[PDB]
Paper text:
β-prism folds in V. cholerae are not unique to VCC: three additional β-prism domains exist in two biofilm matrix proteins called RbmC (rugosity and biofilm structure modulator C) and Bap1 (biofilm associated protein 1). RbmC and Bap1 are related multidomain proteins with overlapping functions, involved in the surface attachment of biofilms and encapsulation of growing cell clusters. For simplicity, we refer to the two β-prism domains of RbmC as RbmC1 and RbmC2. Our results illustrate a common structural mechanism by which vibrio toxin and biofilm β-prism domains target glycans on host cell-surfaces, facilitating cell lysis in one case and cell attachment in another.
Author numbering: 820 to 868, 872 to 957
Write the structure that this text describes.
Amino acid sequence: AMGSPIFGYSNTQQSQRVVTADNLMYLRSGFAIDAIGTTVNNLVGGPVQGGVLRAPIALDQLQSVEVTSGLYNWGGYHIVAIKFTMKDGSSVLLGSTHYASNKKVETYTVPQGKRIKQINVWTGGWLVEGFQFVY
């Protein structure tokens, strides 16, 4: 009712970012998810120097998410891919499903009438291990 569940894992360090009036979610990704934020300057995760910045997600138009996490081929357990499906049916896939094993796929629909106001991000300083929407 008050937020999404925690996708992925929650054993690393949680930071919190406020969604702006643009209602945008920014990510750095490559073979996995490196960082998550709400501006190009406040991303939480690995260092800018670690993946590369992608186009942001319009949270006001986000319908559902499909989050792939598992044993990363280069070590540990992290979120390796997120697929964002928008209200109009189009989707975008950031990260990759192909460089991890023992994989879990989490699906969740953004409830009707909710605005995503904060994003919680769990990161160990290298990759993203979990994230959560707050309404």
